[PDB]
Each structure stands twice: as structure tokens, then as C-alpha cells.
Amino acid sequence: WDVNTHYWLFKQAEKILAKDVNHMRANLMNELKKFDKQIAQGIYDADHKNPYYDTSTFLSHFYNPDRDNTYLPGFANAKITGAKYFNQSVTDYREGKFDTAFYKLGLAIHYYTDISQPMHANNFTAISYPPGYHSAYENYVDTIKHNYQATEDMVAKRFSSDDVKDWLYENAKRAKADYPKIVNAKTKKSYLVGNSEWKKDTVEPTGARLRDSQQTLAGFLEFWSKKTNE
Amino acid sequence: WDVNTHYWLFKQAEKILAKDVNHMRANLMNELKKFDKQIAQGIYDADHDTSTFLSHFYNPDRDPGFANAKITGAKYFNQSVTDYREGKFDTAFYKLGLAIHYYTDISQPMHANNFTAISYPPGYHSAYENYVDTIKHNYQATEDMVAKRFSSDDVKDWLYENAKRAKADYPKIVNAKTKKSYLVGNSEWKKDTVEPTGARLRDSQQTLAGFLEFWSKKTNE
Ligand SMILES: [Fe+3]
Ligand SMILES: [Fe+3]
Ligand SMILES: [Fe+3]
Ligand SMILES: [Fe+3]
Ligand SMILES: [Zn+2]
């Protein structure tokens, strides 16, 4: 996903938690508010710094759940990297290192939301054909995400596992399922010809993907809270 | 708002002032620390006839020989400033505590709209304030907060503006849904009011920090 889609997803997920408050969510919400700056910096650092250091860090933003099986040394994908920061943040929190914990939570949020973008779940990079469509699409999403803010009917979506690796896998699987709505013969030809049909063709599937990502991120934050409270 | 929401608001406002402290604010922070007990007792004493009861309410949209919270809050604030300037610091900070009590009271929407313990449904007022007491700790001061100021040299206008902000939130606290919830005896009103309560508490902390900074400027001018 000055693009701010990742932080925006975090804010929408916070709204989903707040609108249906319960005991544990109230404690989590107070923490997320108090440590917003630390979380925001983690999101930003993964967003605007990490992808551009080399190809190892660039690859860390992608995870194809139907391919990226074995870990080749020095080539961590988004599932491995996201799980690393998530698990370290839980450990730091439980040791009382809150500032670091919430920063690393921000890092984990970036990787988890990155693979909710279908291109990131199917090895479609900025140099995949047609070159430039990846960045054009993400810039476009930034301009229209405000039409798909959290709504009253939404819920936190959870996955059935105590292991965050599986949350990352399942979030990417859902995104990959939407890849044909974003990258297809029609949108690729539209982007090459230079008309805006790809924008009209992808806006509603983008809105559904963003609204799903908000909900799975709300569940992910609740899961983070559960792990810290174990 | 042993319910301690009023003192809690003062402690949150103190945190807001402390995090953005500079040399011009530094003396006030030490004063608040040195006179915490006097301020706390001023807040506590205001909490406990008809003159004293009416004095905790101020509907800013309405016009008795009896003082409302704007008049009583301004009385103690202005006296506190005078006492400070005459060197009567123990008394100055005690009356500051009284003034803090009246100012934070009308940051509570019911107090800004004549909704008392006997207003219908009777008992909802105290049920709400007791509930707020139990959940305020989820809305403590955060680093994004600031002291909020109003454009006036007259504390009466600060009291008016604080009450107007509270009154705008009254429909979020007292409405057909919450009143029916409280009457039927389920807890739905708690779920419906928690987020507006959190927003009200966060605004009140910030306007109180501005109020303390404003008081300090008056004492040092
Ligand atoms: Fe991204
Ligand atoms: Fe991308
Ligand atoms: Fe009160
Ligand atoms: Fe009251
Ligand atoms: Zn009172």
C-alpha cells in the first residue's frame, strides 16, 4: 500500500475496536493512544526507509503464500520479518520495555498490512509487467482510501491460531484471492494505453480489500494484546 | 464528575503542562507540586443547602439570587489571584482548588444542562458519574495533547466556553436510548456512553491545563 495508507489502516482498525468496546479492548485502546507516536514511527520507518536499502529489504515486503515456502538465508520475506517484529514486541512488552515494544508493533503492523495488498501477495513488483503499475496503483489507492473508512457493520476478524506466522499467511491468502481484480488483461491494457479505466475497474475491489484489511488488522491488534496478556 | 474524577482531571492537566514545560511555565509546575495538598483539599471541599447545590450547575444558554457554577467558579478564581498577589499562598492555592472544581464540573454535560440527581430518570446522573470514575483511567493524558486556551481576559468567558463544549455533548450522554437502557436495567448505556465520555474527559483535561496556565499568567502579570 507522502502516501499514508498504512497508518490510515491502523487508524481505521482503532475505530473498529473503539466502536464495540469491551474490557480487554479498553485497555488495549488506552495503550495504542498513549504510544501512538512510537507505533506511527515504526509504521513510517518500515514504510519509507526499509524498502529502499537493498533487494533483501525490498523482498521483505512481499510474501506469496503459495510459493515462499523455505527461507533462503539472507532473503527474509514479509511473513518471516513480520513475525520477527511481532514476537519481539510481545517479549519486550512483557519485560516492560514499552517504548521499544510499541515501536516494533508499528513495524509488525507495516508488514502485516503490506501483504494485505494483492500485488504483495503475488510477487508483483514495480518492475513486473507493466512496469510502473504497482506504484501507480498504490498512489491511486492513497487518493481514494478516504471513501472506505471503517463502518458500523465491521468487526475485528480473527484467524484460528496462536502463532502470528499463520495470521500473516491467512492475511496474504485473502489478498492473493483478490489479485485477479487488480491485475488482469483489462487493467494492464488500460494502464498501458494511458486511460483511467483501470482506476474505475479497481476502485470498488480496492475498497473491499481495504475494508477487509482494516478488519483483519483490528483482529491482529487484539491478538497482539492477547499475546502480551498470556 | 470516593469518586475522584475531579482531582484526576487536575493530575492529567498537570501532566499536559509538565510535558511541554519551558522556563516560563517552570515556576507554576513547582507551585502545583508544593501546594498539591491545598489544591486537592480545595477540590475535595467544593464537592461536599440549595445555594451550594445550584452552584454546581451552569446552563450557558440560560439567564434566582443564587449563584451558578460560572459565578461561583469565577468568584474563587478571581479571589485566588488576589490572594496570590498579596502573598497568601496557602489560601491562594486552596481557592484555586475550589475554582478547579467548579470549572471541571461544567465540563460534565449534565452539569451544563440542568440535569441533576432528581432529573428524570432519577439516579441516572449519579450512575453515570460513578461509571465515569471506574473507566477514566483508560483516558489518561497522552503526548499529543496540548493546553487549550480561550480568547478572553475574563475567567467568566472561560467558564462559559467550557460549559458550551460540554453541553454540545449532552445528547451523547442523555437521550432516548440511554434513558431507556438505564430504566430497563441493562448496561447498554455504559457501552453507548464510553467513547463520548472518553472524548469529553480528554477535552476537559486540555481545557483545564489552559485554565491553569491562564491562572498563572494572571498571578504573575
Ligand atoms: Fe505498502
Ligand atoms: Fe507496494
Ligand atoms: Fe462533579
Ligand atoms: Fe454531578
Ligand atoms: Zn460540584
Side-chain angles (χ1 to χ4, degrees):
Chain A
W1 297 117
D2 64 336
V3 164
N4 77 311
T5 303
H6 285 284
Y7 185 70
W8 174 90
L9 282 164
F10 170 69
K11 295 314 285 192
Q12 294 324 294
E14 277 183 334
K15 295 190 208 154
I16 293 160
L17 295 174
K19 80 184 173 65
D20 299 318
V21 175
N22 71 45
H23 171 237
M24 276 335 280
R25 292 181 171 183
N27 290 128
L28 171 66
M29 284 312 304
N30 169 66
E31 293 180 335
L32 301 176
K33 188 75 180 67
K34 172 167 32 166
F35 290 94
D36 185 77
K37 282 181 176 267
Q38 293 89 344
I39 297 163
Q41 191 72 55
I43 294 175
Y44 176 95
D45 285 351
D47 184 1
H48 304 93
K49 317 293 304 218
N50 183 255
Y52 313 109
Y53 287 125
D54 59 37
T55 67
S56 178
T57 68
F58 176 85
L59 289 175
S60 78
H61 296 277
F62 294 75
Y63 171 61
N64 182 342
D66 299 322
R67 292 188 189 276
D68 284 59
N69 63 347
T70 189
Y71 159 81
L72 177 57
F75 295 89
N77 59 47
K79 184 181 68 182
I80 293 328
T81 304
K84 182 181 85 173
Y85 286 124
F86 179 99
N87 287 325
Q88 290 188 7
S89 67
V90 169
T91 298
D92 294 341
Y93 185 100
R94 287 170 67 82
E95 301 177 354
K97 293 137 95 150
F98 297 120
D99 284 334
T100 297
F102 282 99
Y103 176 79
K104 292 178 178 174
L105 177 57
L107 298 169
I109 290 166
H110 169 90
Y111 291 102
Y112 185 78
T113 52
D114 237 357
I115 59 190
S116 78
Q117 207 275 62
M119 297 172 177
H120 284 244
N122 204 29
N123 304 111
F124 191 90
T125 74
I127 71 167
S128 302
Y129 176 91
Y133 183 50
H134 184 124
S135 295
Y137 174 71
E138 285 183 342
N139 288 336
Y140 174 59
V141 171
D142 183 68
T143 76
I144 52 87
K145 66 192 184 305
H146 65 279
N147 293 317
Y148 304 99
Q149 288 175 64
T151 60
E152 68 195 3
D153 59 302
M154 288 176 186
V155 299
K157 290 180 176 163
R158 299 159 194 98
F159 302 115
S160 64
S161 176
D162 292 330
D163 185 347
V164 70
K165 286 170 37 185
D166 301 326
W167 288 64
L168 288 145
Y169 168 84
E170 292 290 342
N171 212 29
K173 287 294 284 166
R174 297 163 86 83
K176 180 163 189 170
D178 283 348
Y179 177 87
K181 306 173 178 64
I182 299 301
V183 184
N184 57 51
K186 196 162 167 338
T187 59
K188 285 181 289 189
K189 184 187 85 149
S190 166
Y191 170 80
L192 283 162
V193 163
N195 66 41
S196 78
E197 283 176 23
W198 67 265
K199 293 178 180 191
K200 306 181 171 176
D201 277 5
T202 61
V203 61
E204 281 309 293
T206 295
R209 185 97 296 284
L210 294 171
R211 288 183 158 175
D212 186 64
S213 179
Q214 292 163 40
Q215 290 177 98
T216 65
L217 176 56
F220 174 89
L221 295 167
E222 196 175 87
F223 177 62
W224 182 83
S225 183
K226 178 188 165 173
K227 294 294 274 180
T228 63
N229 277 268
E230 222 163 47
Chain B
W1 296 118
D2 62 336
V3 165
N4 73 313
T5 301
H6 287 282
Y7 183 69
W8 176 89
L9 283 163
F10 167 69
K11 296 313 284 193
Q12 299 327 292
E14 192 188 16
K15 296 188 209 151
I16 292 159
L17 295 174
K19 81 182 172 63
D20 305 320
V21 73
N22 68 330
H23 66 81
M24 282 161 186
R25 290 181 171 181
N27 185 51
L28 171 68
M29 301 317 299
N30 282 327
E31 290 182 332
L32 300 175
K33 181 72 181 66
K34 173 60 186 326
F35 292 100
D36 183 77
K37 276 180 171 265
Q38 292 87 342
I39 297 161
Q41 194 190 309
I43 295 175
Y44 176 95
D45 287 351
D47 207 330
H48 304 93
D49 58 39
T50 68
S51 307
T52 68
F53 172 82
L54 292 176
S55 79
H56 297 295
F57 294 76
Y58 170 59
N59 181 343
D61 296 321
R62 296 189 192 277
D63 283 282
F66 299 89
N68 59 47
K70 183 182 68 181
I71 294 169
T72 304
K75 180 182 84 175
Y76 285 120
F77 178 103
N78 290 327
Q79 290 188 8
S80 158
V81 171
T82 297
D83 294 340
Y84 187 106
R85 290 169 71 84
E86 299 174 353
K88 305 157 182 179
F89 295 115
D90 277 280
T91 298
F93 283 94
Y94 178 78
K95 290 179 178 174
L96 176 58
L98 296 167
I100 290 169
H101 173 91
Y102 289 96
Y103 185 81
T104 53
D105 244 359
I106 57 189
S107 80
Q108 207 278 62
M110 298 173 178
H111 285 248
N113 203 28
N114 302 322
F115 190 91
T116 74
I118 77 165
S119 302
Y120 178 89
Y124 182 52
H125 186 126
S126 55
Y128 175 69
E129 285 181 341
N130 289 336
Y131 174 58
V132 169
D133 182 69
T134 77
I135 54 87
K136 65 192 183 306
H137 67 280
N138 291 319
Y139 304 96
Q140 291 176 66
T142 59
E143 293 177 350
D144 58 298
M145 289 177 186
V146 299
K148 292 182 177 165
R149 300 158 261 260
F150 305 117
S151 282
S152 176
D153 294 327
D154 185 346
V155 72
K156 285 170 36 185
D157 299 325
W158 288 65
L159 290 145
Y160 166 84
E161 290 288 340
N162 213 30
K164 289 292 283 170
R165 298 162 88 86
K167 181 165 189 172
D169 286 349
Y170 177 88
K172 306 172 176 63
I173 303 302
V174 185
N175 55 51
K177 197 165 167 338
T178 61
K179 287 181 290 188
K180 181 194 289 196
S181 166
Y182 172 80
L183 283 165
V184 80
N186 67 39
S187 298
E188 284 315 291
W189 66 266
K190 293 177 178 193
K191 312 174 176 173
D192 278 8
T193 60
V194 60
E195 279 309 293
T197 295
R200 185 96 296 286
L201 292 172
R202 288 182 43 101
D203 186 63
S204 179
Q205 295 164 48
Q206 289 180 99
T207 65
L208 177 57
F211 177 90
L212 296 168
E213 191 180 290
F214 174 61
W215 181 83
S216 186
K217 288 173 188 167
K218 292 292 205 134
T219 65
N220 283 329
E221 74 185 12

